Design an enzyme around this catalytic site. Structure first.
Site, PDB file in Angstrom:
ATOM      1  N   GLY A   1       6.406  -0.732   0.080  1.00  0.00           N
ATOM      2  CA  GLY A   1       7.304   0.369   0.356  1.00  0.00           C
ATOM      3  C   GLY A   1       7.686   0.408   1.812  1.00  0.00           C
ATOM      4  O   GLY A   1       7.440  -0.539   2.561  1.00  0.00           O
TER       5      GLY A   1
ATOM      6  N   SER B   1       1.873   5.276  -2.014  1.00  0.00           N
ATOM      7  CA  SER B   1       2.078   5.850  -3.339  1.00  0.00           C
ATOM      8  C   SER B   1       3.024   5.002  -4.174  1.00  0.00           C
ATOM      9  O   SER B   1       2.857   4.879  -5.390  1.00  0.00           O
ATOM     10  CB  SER B   1       2.541   7.313  -3.287  1.00  0.00           C
ATOM     11  OG  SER B   1       3.853   7.469  -2.775  1.00  0.00           O
TER      12      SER B   1
ATOM     13  N   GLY C   1       3.625   4.683   8.624  1.00  0.00           N
ATOM     14  CA  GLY C   1       3.316   6.113   8.552  1.00  0.00           C
ATOM     15  C   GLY C   1       1.936   6.361   7.952  1.00  0.00           C
ATOM     16  O   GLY C   1       1.306   7.368   8.256  1.00  0.00           O
ATOM     17  N   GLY C   2       1.494   5.441   7.098  1.00  0.00           N
ATOM     18  CA  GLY C   2       0.171   5.493   6.478  1.00  0.00           C
ATOM     19  C   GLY C   2      -0.885   4.653   7.191  1.00  0.00           C
ATOM     20  O   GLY C   2      -0.953   4.700   8.441  1.00  0.00           O
TER      21      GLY C   2
ATOM     22  N   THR D   1       0.858  -1.206   0.000  1.00  0.00           N
ATOM     23  CA  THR D   1       0.000   0.000   0.000  1.00  0.00           C
ATOM     24  C   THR D   1       0.888   1.249   0.000  1.00  0.00           C
ATOM     25  O   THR D   1       2.074   1.187   0.340  1.00  0.00           O
ATOM     26  CB  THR D   1      -0.838   0.026   1.311  1.00  0.00           C
ATOM     27  OG1 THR D   1      -1.754  -1.069   1.325  1.00  0.00           O
ATOM     28  CG2 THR D   1      -1.772   1.240   1.352  1.00  0.00           C
TER      29      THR D   1
ATOM     30  N   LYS E   1      14.326   7.078   1.129  1.00  0.00           N
ATOM     31  CA  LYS E   1      13.980   6.208   2.256  1.00  0.00           C
ATOM     32  C   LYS E   1      15.195   5.553   2.924  1.00  0.00           C
ATOM     33  O   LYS E   1      15.078   5.005   4.015  1.00  0.00           O
ATOM     34  CB  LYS E   1      13.000   5.105   1.813  1.00  0.00           C
ATOM     35  CG  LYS E   1      11.686   5.618   1.150  1.00  0.00           C
ATOM     36  CD  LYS E   1      11.095   6.828   1.815  1.00  0.00           C
ATOM     37  CE  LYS E   1       9.683   7.154   1.237  1.00  0.00           C
ATOM     38  NZ  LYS E   1       8.784   6.017   0.878  1.00  0.00           N
TER      39      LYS E   1
ATOM     40  N   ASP F   1       8.777   3.576   5.105  1.00  0.00           N
ATOM     41  CA  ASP F   1       9.071   4.947   5.472  1.00  0.00           C
ATOM     42  C   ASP F   1      10.578   5.126   5.597  1.00  0.00           C
ATOM     43  O   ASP F   1      11.083   6.202   5.250  1.00  0.00           O
ATOM     44  CB  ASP F   1       8.346   5.290   6.755  1.00  0.00           C
ATOM     45  CG  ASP F   1       6.864   5.174   6.596  1.00  0.00           C
ATOM     46  OD1 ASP F   1       6.321   5.773   5.631  1.00  0.00           O
ATOM     47  OD2 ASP F   1       6.230   4.434   7.383  1.00  0.00           O
TER      48      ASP F   1
ATOM     49  N   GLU G   1       0.007  -4.955   7.022  1.00  0.00           N
ATOM     50  CA  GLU G   1       1.293  -5.081   6.310  1.00  0.00           C
ATOM     51  C   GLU G   1       2.226  -6.034   7.048  1.00  0.00           C
ATOM     52  O   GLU G   1       2.853  -6.872   6.411  1.00  0.00           O
ATOM     53  CB  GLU G   1       1.935  -3.721   6.178  1.00  0.00           C
ATOM     54  CG  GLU G   1       1.213  -2.766   5.226  1.00  0.00           C
ATOM     55  CD  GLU G   1       1.720  -1.354   5.320  1.00  0.00           C
ATOM     56  OE1 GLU G   1       2.634  -1.078   6.072  1.00  0.00           O
ATOM     57  OE2 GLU G   1       1.171  -0.491   4.615  1.00  0.00           O
TER      58      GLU G   1
HETATM   59  O1  LIG Z   1       5.613   4.671  -0.673  1.00  0.00           O
HETATM   60  P1  LIG Z   1       5.027   5.741   0.238  1.00  0.00           P
HETATM   61  O2  LIG Z   1       3.918   6.564  -0.376  1.00  0.00           O
HETATM   62  O3  LIG Z   1       6.134   6.609   0.784  1.00  0.00           O
HETATM   63  O4  LIG Z   1       4.234   5.044   1.451  1.00  0.00           O
HETATM   64  C1  LIG Z   1       4.843   4.264   2.509  1.00  0.00           C
HETATM   65  C2  LIG Z   1       3.738   3.739   3.422  1.00  0.00           C
HETATM   66  O5  LIG Z   1       2.901   2.810   2.705  1.00  0.00           O
HETATM   67  C3  LIG Z   1       3.173   1.571   3.423  1.00  0.00           C
HETATM   68  O6  LIG Z   1       3.969   0.837   2.755  1.00  0.00           O
HETATM   69  C4  LIG Z   1       3.525   1.921   4.691  1.00  0.00           C
HETATM   70  O7  LIG Z   1       3.953   1.056   5.564  1.00  0.00           O
HETATM   71  C5  LIG Z   1       4.046   3.177   4.630  1.00  0.00           C
HETATM   72  O8  LIG Z   1       4.060   3.917   5.652  1.00  0.00           O
END
Ligand SMILES: O=P(O)(O)OC[C@H]1O[C@@H](O)[C@@H](O)[C@@H]1O
Ligand SMILES: O=P(O)(O)OC[C@H]1O[C@@H](O)[C@@H](O)[C@@H]1O
Lengths: 168, 212
Positions: A33, A8, A47-48, A6, A71, A35, A53
């Site tokens: 992804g 962006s 963070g989201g 999940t 990151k 953080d 997850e």
């Molecule tokens: O790729 P992005 O938008 O920076 O989003 C990262 C977030 O999406 C997830 O994976 C999370 O664990 C995390 O915080």
């Protein structure tokens, strides 16, 4: 059946509403992804979201982290560490997180899919992410901590100006 | 009778403000005892709605845990207690009990003699699990040497399910507590081993035995 993240950045098992996991007994990979990711492949996530997850990642044989270069960090902790907490335990958990060296901040106006709250912990320089993961998982009232340290990434694909760097 | 042994320990705990109060048939006797102190205490923090209702009925004010930043004592039962004062709990509110016990300075375990064991594990260990994680957590509990059994038709106050883990001889309860707490999807494990009892009051035919 691929584990799918999940954010962006046969079928699948998915980490957000944006197969159900109980229908499978294994996943080849989980692609998601983070953080932050350190040199030891350990990550901060959440963070989201956070709990879904980490559970899916626990079933996958290989965690493939996908992230832009921003990151990558040497010491985890600049990005505040998410901790999902049983609501009745919020102040108790916060007190223990202070004892461990952080400054917990209630994520105002947000609830998780499990009906819990989040404390985002600021100011930690997490020199030993496994020890910290274990210390936070020991606290009654903690549901999940966003340190993926006992189980980190197996491969990282990092988006740079020069192209995709693969770290195994 | 076993119930009179429970009554003996529940009342003996009065020897020991805002009081932390447990749950179950032994704790119920302690709540009766606490009622005799209705005009002497400030109130209590309760580990279950059943305990809250009984406390309220005896004129004892019940505070939420978030209204205190400390608790002197927490008096509760257990399914098993070993010689190291480590307990299995959760046979009945596991998460709330463990959170209140984490805030209390002194955990007083009240139990009849049948709760004393040398090695924890004959009584199945409760593990509260996020529902989407049930099968995953069960696979890991098998790897750790247990036989997880879904507690059919029960949901916790947090909306989670329980796996009761049978067949473990838990020789090192702290190691086992840490191993289960490490598993994503585990909310709470009913091993009170890193934080066990500080005092145990055990009801026996010869009277209440105090172990510190
Ligand atoms: O790729 P992005 O938008 O920076 O989003 C990262 C977030 O999406 C997830 O994976 C999370 O664990 C995390 O915080
Ligand atoms: O005293 P009893 O009736 O055996 O009840 C014990 C149970 O009530 C609670 O303490 C629980 O943790 C536990 O399982």
């Amino acid at each position: 059946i691929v584990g799918v993240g999940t954010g962006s950045t046969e079928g699948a098992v998915s980490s957000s509403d944006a197969f159900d996991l109980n229908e499978v007994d294994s996943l080849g990979i989980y692609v998601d992804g983070a953080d932050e990711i350190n040199g030891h492949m350990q990550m901060i996530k959440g963070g989201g979201a956070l709990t879904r997850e980490k559970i899916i990642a626990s079933v996958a044989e290989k965690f493939i982290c996908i992230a832009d270069a921003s990151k990558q960090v040497d010491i985890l902790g600049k990005f505040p560490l998410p901790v999902e907490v049983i609501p009745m335990a919020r102040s108790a958990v916060a007190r223990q997180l202070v004892k461990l060296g952080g400054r917990p901040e209630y994520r105002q106006g947000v609830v998780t899919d499990n009906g819990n709250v989040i404390l985002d912990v600021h100011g930690m320089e997490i020199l030993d992410p496994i020890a910290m993961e274990n210390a936070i998982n020991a606290i009654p009232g903690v549901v999940t901590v966003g340190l993926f340290a006992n189980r980190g990434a197996d491969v990282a694909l990092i988006g740079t100006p020069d192209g995709v760097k693969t770290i195994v």
